[PDB]
C-alpha cells in the first residue's frame, strides 16, 4: 500500500534532473509515474530539487492550504519546477502534455512524524504578487527556527542554512542562531520568564528550559559572496522579544 508520502514522491518529485530540457518531458514523465494509467491527469507539477530540500519546506513559511487546512508551507527559496498541462489534442491513452519550465516558490501540505510532504498545493512567484507579506513573526521563523532537525549534524550546517534562509543575499550576516525545537515550544516562551531585552525594553522572555540551538558565526576569512561560517551546537536557554496578537516571538535577543 502506497503511503501519502510515497505518492507525493511519485507524483511530484524529479530529483534526477535539475530541469526539463525537452518538450517531451511531460509526455514521458506523466506516463512513467502512472499519472495517465486510468485517465489523462490534466495538470501536474514536478519539482527538480532534492528530496531533502523539498522535505525541508515543511519547516518553512506556514501558509493556509487551498482547502482551508493550516498544514501548508511555502518554500523560502524559488525552486526549479516543470508544469505539465494536457494539450487540447490529447486523447487517452495517448495523453499529450505541454511542458513548461519555471522557477517559483512551492507550497506543499505536510503530515506525519517525520513531518513530510503529502500534497502539492501550488506554486507562487514574487512577480505574481502572491508570495505574500512577511510578518515579523514569519521573519523570526525564517531566521531563527529549524524544527526539521534535532541538532546540527555537520560542520557545514551553517554554510548551508545561512544561505538557504536567505541570510547571505546582499552580504554575510555575521552571527545568527537557529533553534531546534517545535514552534509550539518556542512560542510558549512568550509566557515564561519575563526579562529586559538588550535594548532596555521589557517585552523579552527567557525560556524556562534549555533548548537545542545552533550558533552560526562567520569565520575570520569569510568574504561575500562566498560566506563561510563556523557551526556550534549547544543547549542553552533562549531569550526572545515577543509582540502582537497572538503574542509571539519577533526577535532573538540572546541565549544564556
UniProtKB/Swiss-Prot annotation:
Cellular compartment(s): Secreted
Catalytic site: 12, 119, 144, 251
EC number of the protein: 4.6.1.18
UniProt KW Membrane keyword: no
Keywords: Disulfide bond, Endonuclease, Glycation, Glycoprotein, Hydrolase, Lyase, Nuclease, Secreted, Signal
Its biological purpose: Endonuclease that catalyzes the cleavage of RNA on the 3' side of pyrimidine nucleotides. Acts on single-stranded and double-stranded RNA.
Gene Ontology CC: one annotated term: extracellular region
Tissue and organ distribution: Pancreas.
Catalytic activity: an [RNA] containing cytidine + H2O = an [RNA]-3'-cytidine-3'-phosphate + a 5'-hydroxy-ribonucleotide-3'-[RNA]; an [RNA] containing uridine + H2O = an [RNA]-3'-uridine-3'-phosphate + a 5'-hydroxy-ribonucleotide-3'-[RNA]
Record family assignment: Belongs to the pancreatic ribonuclease family.
Binding residues for substrate: 7, 10, 41-45, 66, 85, 139, 142, 173-177, 198, 217
The protein's name in its UniProt record: Ribonuclease pancreatic
Record note on quaternary structure: Interacts with and forms tight 1:1 complexes with RNH1. Dimerization of two such complexes may occur. Interaction with RNH1 inhibits this protein. Monomer.
Gene Ontology MF term list: lyase activity; nucleic acid binding; ribonuclease A activity; RNA nuclease activity
Residues of the full protein shown: 27 to 150 of 150
An example Gene Ontology biological process: defense response to Gram-positive bacterium
Gene that produces this protein: RNASE1
Domain of life: Eukaryota
Glycan-carrying positions: 1, 7, 34, 37, 41, 133, 139, 166, 169, 173
Amino acid at each position: 500500500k502506497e503511503t501519502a508520502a510515497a505518492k507525493f514522491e511519485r507524483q511530484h518529485m524529479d530529483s534526477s534532473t535539475s530541469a526539463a530540457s525537452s518538450s517531451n518531458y511531460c509526455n514521458q514523465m506523466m506516463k512513467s509515474r502512472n499519472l495517465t494509467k486510468d485517465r489523462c491527469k490534466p495538470v501536474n507539477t514536478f519539482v527538480h530539487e532534492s528530496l531533502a530540500d523539498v522535505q525541508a519546506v515543511c519547516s518553512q513559511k506556514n501558509v493556509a492550504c487551498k482547502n482551508g487546512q493550516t498544514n501548508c508551507y511555502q518554500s523560502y527559496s524559488t525552486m526549479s519546477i516543470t508544469d505539465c498541462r494536457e494539450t487540447g489534442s490529447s486523447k487517452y491513452p495517448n495523453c499529450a502534455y505541454k511542458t513548461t519550465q519555471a522557477n517559483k516558490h512551492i507550497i506543499v501540505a505536510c503530515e506525519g512524524n517525520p513531518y513530510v510532504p503529502v500534497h502539492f498545493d501550488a506554486s507562487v512567484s514574487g512577480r505574481s504578487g502572491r508570495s505574500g507579506k512577511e510578518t515579523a513573526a514569519a521573519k523570526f521563523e525564517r531566521q531563527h527556527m529549524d524544527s526539521s532537525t534535532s541538532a546540527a549534524s555537520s560542520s557545514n550546517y551553517c554554510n548551508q542554512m545561512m544561505k538557504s534562509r536567505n541570510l547571505t543575499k546582499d552580504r554575510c550576516k555575521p552571527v545568527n542562531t537557529f533553534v531546534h525545537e517545535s514552534l509550539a515550544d518556542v512560542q510558549a516562551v512568550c509566557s515564561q520568564k519575563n526579562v529586559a531585552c538588550k535594548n532596555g525594553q521589557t517585552n523579552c522572555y527567557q525560556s524556562y528550559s534549555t533548548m537545542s540551538i545552533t550558533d552560526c558565526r562567520e569565520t575570520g576569512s569569510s568574504k561575500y559572496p562566498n560566506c563561510a561560517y563556523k557551526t556550534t551546537q549547544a543547549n542553552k536557554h533562549i531569550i526572545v522579544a515577543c509582540e502582537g496578537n497572538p503574542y509571539v516571538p519577533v526577535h532573538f535577543d540572546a541565549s544564556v
